[PDB]
Amino acid sequence: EQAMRERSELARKGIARAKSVVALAYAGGVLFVAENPSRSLQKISELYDRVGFAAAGKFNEFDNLRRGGIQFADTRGYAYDRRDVTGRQLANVYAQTLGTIFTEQAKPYEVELCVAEVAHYGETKRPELYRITYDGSIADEPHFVVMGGTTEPIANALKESYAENASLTDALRIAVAALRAVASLEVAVLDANRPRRAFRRITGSALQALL
């Protein structure tokens, strides 16, 4: 439908105008790196114990979703077990929400989400990444995810420079590199070696010391 296409373009355009974000699986877990000038606005966030979230696009909109996501997660965890919350699940939820918005609201959300899950401390599992787009379509890549701005230059840069099971400091370089296509960076990692809370932000000396 031309109207649907128009909405997609409005959404696909606004996303192509925002800062880029990268999420990739590494030996210690999932690494998030997004270009971000702001010091108080954030594109990367914890959602639950072992799942993180990164988005690109119009802030007021993707933040709103970040909150909704935390809301939903914390509720499920209380009504069931803490282990009922999964990347799989939350992505599903975000899909149905963006899907609804894209259909029934006046303007589609100009956003692109990534929900990443990592293994629990006891178990060994391959990290899972999910990309939910402005229309509710949900993809699940196995190695990395790129969102916002001009994605091709960065997706290609990774395709070739991507070593799976890199060390942290390695994967960090590969990412910053692929982004090129330092206090302007928001970095965080889903450390699968933490006992319960996996999300951990790296700032200041920590980012520096990995460079």
């Binding site: 069931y80 077990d81 803490r82």
Partner: peptide, 21 residues
Amino acid sequence: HYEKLEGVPLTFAGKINRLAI
């Protein structure tokens, strides 16, 4: 019900929780 909806069974703690509720 939970299992058909979510693909897997509740953890034991989960089972206890629903019971208690």
